[PDB]
mmCIF file of C-alpha atoms and ligand atoms in Angstrom:
data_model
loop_
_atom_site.group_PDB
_atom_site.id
_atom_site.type_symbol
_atom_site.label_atom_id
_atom_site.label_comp_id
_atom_site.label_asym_id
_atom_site.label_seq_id
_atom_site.Cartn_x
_atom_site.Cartn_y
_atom_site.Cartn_z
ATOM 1 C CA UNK A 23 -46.798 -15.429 -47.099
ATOM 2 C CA UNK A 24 -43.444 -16.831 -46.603
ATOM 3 C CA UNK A 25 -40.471 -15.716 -48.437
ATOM 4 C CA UNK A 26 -38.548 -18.216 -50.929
ATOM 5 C CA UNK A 27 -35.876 -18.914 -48.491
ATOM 6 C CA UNK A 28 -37.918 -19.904 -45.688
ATOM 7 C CA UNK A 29 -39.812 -22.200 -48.315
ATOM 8 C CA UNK A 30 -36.272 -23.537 -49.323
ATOM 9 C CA UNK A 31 -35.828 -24.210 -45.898
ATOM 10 C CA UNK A 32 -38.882 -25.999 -44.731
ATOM 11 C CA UNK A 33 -38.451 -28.169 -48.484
ATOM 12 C CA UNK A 34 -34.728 -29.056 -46.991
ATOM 13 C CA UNK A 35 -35.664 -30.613 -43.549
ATOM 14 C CA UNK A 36 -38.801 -31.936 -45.070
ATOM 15 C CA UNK A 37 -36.338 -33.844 -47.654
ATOM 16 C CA UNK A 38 -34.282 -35.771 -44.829
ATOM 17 C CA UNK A 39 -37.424 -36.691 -43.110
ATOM 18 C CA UNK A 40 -38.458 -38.402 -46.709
ATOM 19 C CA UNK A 41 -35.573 -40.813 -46.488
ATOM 20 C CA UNK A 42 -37.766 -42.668 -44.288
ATOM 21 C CA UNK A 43 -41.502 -41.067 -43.992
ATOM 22 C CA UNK A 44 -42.903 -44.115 -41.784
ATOM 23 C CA UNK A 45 -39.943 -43.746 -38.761
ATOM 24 C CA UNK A 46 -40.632 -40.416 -39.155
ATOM 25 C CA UNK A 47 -44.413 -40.589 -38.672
ATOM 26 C CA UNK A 48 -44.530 -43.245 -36.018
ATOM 27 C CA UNK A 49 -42.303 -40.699 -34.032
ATOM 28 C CA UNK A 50 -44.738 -37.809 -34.552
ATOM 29 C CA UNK A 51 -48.160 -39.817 -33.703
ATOM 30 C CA UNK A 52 -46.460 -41.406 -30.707
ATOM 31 C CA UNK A 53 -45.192 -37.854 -29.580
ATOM 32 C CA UNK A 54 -48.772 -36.490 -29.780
ATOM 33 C CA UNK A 55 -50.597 -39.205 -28.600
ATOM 34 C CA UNK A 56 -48.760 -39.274 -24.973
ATOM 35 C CA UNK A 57 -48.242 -35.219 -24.488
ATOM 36 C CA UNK A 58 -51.752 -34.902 -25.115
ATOM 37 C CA UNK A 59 -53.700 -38.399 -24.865
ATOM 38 C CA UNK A 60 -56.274 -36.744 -25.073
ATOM 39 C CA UNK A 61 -56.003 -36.984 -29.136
ATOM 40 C CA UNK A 62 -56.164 -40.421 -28.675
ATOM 41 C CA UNK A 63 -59.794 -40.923 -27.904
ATOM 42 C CA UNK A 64 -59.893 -39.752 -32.182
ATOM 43 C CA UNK A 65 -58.983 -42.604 -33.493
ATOM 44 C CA UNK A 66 -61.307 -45.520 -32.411
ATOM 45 C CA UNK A 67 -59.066 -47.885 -33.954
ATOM 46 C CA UNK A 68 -56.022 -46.748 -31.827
ATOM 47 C CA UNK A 69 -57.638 -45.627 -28.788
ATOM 48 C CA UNK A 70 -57.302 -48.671 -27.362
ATOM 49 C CA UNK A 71 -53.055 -48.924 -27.129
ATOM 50 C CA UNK A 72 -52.053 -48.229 -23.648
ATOM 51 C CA UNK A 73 -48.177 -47.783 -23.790
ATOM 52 C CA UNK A 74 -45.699 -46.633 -25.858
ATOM 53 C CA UNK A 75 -44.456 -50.316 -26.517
ATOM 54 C CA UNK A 76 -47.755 -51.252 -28.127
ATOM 55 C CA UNK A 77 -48.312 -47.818 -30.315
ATOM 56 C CA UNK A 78 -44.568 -49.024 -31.696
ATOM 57 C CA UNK A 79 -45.983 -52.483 -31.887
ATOM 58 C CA UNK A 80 -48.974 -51.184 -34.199
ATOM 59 C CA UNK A 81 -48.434 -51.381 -38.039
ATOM 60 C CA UNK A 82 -51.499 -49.415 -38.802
ATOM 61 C CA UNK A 83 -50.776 -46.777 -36.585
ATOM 62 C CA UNK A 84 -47.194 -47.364 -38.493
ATOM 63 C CA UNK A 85 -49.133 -46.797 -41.593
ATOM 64 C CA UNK A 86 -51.245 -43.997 -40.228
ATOM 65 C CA UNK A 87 -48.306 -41.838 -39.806
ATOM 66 C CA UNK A 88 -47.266 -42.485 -43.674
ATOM 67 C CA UNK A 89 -50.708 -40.963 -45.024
ATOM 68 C CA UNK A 90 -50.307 -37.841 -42.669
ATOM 69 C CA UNK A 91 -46.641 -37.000 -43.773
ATOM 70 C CA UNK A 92 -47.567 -37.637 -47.010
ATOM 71 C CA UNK A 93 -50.568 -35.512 -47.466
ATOM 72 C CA UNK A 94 -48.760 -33.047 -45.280
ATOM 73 C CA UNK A 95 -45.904 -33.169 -47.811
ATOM 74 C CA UNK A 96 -47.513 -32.856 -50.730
ATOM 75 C CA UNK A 97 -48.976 -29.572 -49.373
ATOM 76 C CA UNK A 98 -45.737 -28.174 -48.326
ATOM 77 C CA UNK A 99 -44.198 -28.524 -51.489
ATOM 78 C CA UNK A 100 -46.963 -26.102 -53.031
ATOM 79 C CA UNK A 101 -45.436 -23.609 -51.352
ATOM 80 C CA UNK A 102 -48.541 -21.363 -50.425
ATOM 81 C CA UNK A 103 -50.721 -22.662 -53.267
ATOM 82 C CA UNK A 104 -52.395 -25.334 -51.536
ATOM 83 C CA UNK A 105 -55.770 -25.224 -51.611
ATOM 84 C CA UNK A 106 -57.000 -27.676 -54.492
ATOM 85 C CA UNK A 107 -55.366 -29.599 -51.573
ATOM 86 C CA UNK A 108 -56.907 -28.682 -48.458
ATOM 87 C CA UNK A 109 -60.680 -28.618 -49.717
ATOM 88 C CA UNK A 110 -60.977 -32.319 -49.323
ATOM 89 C CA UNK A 111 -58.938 -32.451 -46.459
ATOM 90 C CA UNK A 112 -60.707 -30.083 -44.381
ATOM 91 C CA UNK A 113 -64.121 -31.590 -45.395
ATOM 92 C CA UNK A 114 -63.319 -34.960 -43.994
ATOM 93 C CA UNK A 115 -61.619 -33.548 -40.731
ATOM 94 C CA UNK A 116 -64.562 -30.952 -40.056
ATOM 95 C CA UNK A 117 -67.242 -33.627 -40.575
ATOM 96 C CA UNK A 118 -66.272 -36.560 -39.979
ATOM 97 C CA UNK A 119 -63.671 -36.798 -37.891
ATOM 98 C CA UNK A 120 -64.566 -33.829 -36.250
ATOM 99 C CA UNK A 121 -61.060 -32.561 -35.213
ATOM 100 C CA UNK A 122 -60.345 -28.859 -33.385
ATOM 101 C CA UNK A 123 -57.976 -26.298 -34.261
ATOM 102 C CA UNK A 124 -56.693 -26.588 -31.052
ATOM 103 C CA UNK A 125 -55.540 -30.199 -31.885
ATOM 104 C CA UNK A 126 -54.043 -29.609 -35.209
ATOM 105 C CA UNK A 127 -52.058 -27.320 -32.888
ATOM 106 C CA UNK A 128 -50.901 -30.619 -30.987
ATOM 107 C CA UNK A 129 -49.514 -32.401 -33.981
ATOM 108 C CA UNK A 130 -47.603 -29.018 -35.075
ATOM 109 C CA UNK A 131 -46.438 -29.269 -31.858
ATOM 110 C CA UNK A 132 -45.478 -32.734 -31.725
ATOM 111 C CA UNK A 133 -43.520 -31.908 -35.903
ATOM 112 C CA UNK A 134 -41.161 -29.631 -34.786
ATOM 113 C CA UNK A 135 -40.263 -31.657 -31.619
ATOM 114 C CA UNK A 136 -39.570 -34.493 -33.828
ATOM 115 C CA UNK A 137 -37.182 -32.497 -36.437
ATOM 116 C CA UNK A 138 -35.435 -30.709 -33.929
ATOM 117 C CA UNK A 139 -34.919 -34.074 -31.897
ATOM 118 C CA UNK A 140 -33.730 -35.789 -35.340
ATOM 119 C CA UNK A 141 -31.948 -33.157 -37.533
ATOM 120 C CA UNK A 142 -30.356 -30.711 -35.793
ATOM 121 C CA UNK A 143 -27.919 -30.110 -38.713
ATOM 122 C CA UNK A 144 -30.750 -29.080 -40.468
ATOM 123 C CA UNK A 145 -33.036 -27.436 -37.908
ATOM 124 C CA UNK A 146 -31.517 -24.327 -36.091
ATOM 125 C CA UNK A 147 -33.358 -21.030 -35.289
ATOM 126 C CA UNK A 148 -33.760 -19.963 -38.808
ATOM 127 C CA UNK A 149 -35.347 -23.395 -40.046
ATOM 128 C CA UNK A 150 -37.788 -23.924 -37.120
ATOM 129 C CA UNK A 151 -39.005 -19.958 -37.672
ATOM 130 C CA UNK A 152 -39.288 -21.011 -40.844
ATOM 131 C CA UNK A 153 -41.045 -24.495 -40.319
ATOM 132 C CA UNK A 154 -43.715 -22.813 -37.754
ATOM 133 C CA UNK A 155 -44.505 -20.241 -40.361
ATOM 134 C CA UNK A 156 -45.241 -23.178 -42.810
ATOM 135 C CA UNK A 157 -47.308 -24.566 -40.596
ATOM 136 C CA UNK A 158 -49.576 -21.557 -39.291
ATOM 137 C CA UNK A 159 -50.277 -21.109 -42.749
ATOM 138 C CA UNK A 160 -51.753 -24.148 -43.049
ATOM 139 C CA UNK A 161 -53.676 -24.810 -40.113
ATOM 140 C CA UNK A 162 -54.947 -20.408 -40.452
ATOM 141 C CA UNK A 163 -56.076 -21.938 -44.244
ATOM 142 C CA UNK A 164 -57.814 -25.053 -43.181
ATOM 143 C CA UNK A 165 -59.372 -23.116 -39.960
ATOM 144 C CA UNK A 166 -61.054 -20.634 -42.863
ATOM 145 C CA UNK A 167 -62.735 -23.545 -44.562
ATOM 146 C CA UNK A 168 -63.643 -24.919 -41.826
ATOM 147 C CA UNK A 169 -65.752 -21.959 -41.228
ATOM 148 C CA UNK A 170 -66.770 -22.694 -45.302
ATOM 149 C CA UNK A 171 -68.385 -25.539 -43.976
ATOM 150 C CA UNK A 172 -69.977 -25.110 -41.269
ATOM 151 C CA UNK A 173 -67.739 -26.174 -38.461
ATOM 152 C CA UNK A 174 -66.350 -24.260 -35.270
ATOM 153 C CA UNK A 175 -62.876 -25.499 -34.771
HETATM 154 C C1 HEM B 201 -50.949 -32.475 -40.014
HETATM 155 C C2 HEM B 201 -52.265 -32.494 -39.867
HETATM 156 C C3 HEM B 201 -53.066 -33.678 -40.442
HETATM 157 C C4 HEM B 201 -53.069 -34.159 -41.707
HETATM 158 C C5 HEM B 201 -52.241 -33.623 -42.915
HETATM 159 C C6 HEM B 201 -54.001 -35.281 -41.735
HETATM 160 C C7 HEM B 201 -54.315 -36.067 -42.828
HETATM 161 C C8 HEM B 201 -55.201 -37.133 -42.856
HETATM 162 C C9 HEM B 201 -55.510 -37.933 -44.021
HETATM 163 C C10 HEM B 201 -54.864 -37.688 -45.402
HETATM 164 C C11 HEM B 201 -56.412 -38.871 -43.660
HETATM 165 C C12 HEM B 201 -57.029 -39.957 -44.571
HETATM 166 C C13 HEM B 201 -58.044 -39.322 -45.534
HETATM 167 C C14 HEM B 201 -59.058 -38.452 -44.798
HETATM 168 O O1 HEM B 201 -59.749 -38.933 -43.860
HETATM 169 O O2 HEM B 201 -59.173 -37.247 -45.151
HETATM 170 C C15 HEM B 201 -56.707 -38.688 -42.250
HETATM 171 C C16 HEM B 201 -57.578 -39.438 -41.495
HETATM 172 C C17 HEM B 201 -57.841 -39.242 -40.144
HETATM 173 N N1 HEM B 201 -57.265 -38.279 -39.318
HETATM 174 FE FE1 HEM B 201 -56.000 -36.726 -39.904
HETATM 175 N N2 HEM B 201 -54.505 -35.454 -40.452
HETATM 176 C C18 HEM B 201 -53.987 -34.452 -39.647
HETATM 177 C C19 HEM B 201 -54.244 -34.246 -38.308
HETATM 178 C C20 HEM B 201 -55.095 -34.980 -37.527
HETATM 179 C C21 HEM B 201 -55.374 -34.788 -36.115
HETATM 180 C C22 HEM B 201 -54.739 -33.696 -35.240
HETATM 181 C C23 HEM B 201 -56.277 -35.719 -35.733
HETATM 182 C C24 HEM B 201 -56.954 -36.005 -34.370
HETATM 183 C C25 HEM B 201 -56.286 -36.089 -33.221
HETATM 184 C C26 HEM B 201 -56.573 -36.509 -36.899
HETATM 185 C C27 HEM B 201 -57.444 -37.563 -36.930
HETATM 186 C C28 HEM B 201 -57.758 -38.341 -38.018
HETATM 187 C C29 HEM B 201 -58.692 -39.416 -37.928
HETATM 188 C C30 HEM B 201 -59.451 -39.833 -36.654
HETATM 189 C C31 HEM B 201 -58.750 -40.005 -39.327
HETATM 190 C C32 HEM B 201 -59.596 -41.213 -39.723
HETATM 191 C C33 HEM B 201 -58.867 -42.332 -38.981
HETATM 192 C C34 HEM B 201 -58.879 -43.618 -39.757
HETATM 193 O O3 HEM B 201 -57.970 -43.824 -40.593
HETATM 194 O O4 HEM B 201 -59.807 -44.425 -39.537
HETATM 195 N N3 HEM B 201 -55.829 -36.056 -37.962
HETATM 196 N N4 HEM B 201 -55.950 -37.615 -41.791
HETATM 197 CL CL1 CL B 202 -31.206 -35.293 -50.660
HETATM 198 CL CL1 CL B 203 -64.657 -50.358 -28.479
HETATM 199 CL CL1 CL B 204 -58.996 -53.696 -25.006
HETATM 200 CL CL1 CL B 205 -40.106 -51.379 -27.839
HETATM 201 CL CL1 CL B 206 -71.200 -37.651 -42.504
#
């Protein structure tokens, strides 16, 4: 459980990187894709960009990276109570995309790089304690269900 201040403070970063969700996404998908390309070969629709210049060049990898913040976002701001939320989401990513814990580990990764990189101002110590918290709740949540269903990780 996090307290109500470190929820404040994830919900105040998360707010600047809403004044423009698909920069913000690109960034992060980019970021993952080319630490670990790995995550790439996931996506049989983008696996198939071989530099940077053409994942910037893509508009539904541009696109992409607007359903994940948002769907990420709307989870976040139900501070803890999230799981009407991640039921369908963990379905799809168990079964049919078939996606490990390990990678879901990547993109967390690849998040806080991105805010630190982009909002400093808003992203010292406290908020990126705060942030990682946020997000090992989530991905400790969706690992459960994914057990639920009948899926390693
Ligand atoms: C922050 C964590 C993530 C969130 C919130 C998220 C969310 C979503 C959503 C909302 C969709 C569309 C609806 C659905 O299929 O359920 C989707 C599709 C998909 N996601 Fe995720 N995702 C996350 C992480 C990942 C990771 C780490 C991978 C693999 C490297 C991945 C791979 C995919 C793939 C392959 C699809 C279908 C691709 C397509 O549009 O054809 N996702 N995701
Ligand atoms: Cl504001
Ligand atoms: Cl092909
Ligand atoms: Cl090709
Ligand atoms: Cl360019
Ligand atoms: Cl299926």
């Amino acid at each position: 459980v996090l307290s109500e201040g470190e929820w404040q403070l994830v919900l105040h970063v998360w707010a600047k990187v809403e004044a423009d969700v698909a920069g913000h996404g690109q960034d992060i998908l980019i970021r993952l894709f080319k630490s670990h390309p790995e995550t790439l070969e996931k996506f049989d629709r983008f696996k198939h960009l071989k530099t940077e210049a053409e994942m910037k060049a893509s508009e539904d990898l541009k696109k992409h990276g607007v359903t994940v913040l948002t769907a990420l976002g709307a989870i976040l701001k139900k501070k803890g109570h999230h799981e009407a939320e991640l039921k369908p989401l963990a379905q799809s990513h168990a079964t049919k995309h078939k996606i490990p814990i390990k990678y879901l580990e990547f993109i967390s990764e690849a998040i806080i790089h991105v805010l630190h990189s982009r909002h400093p101002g808003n992203f010292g110590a406290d908020a990126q304690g705060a942030m990682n918290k946020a997000l090992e709740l989530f991905r400790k949540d969706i690992a459960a269900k994914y057990k639920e269903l009948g899926y390693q990780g």
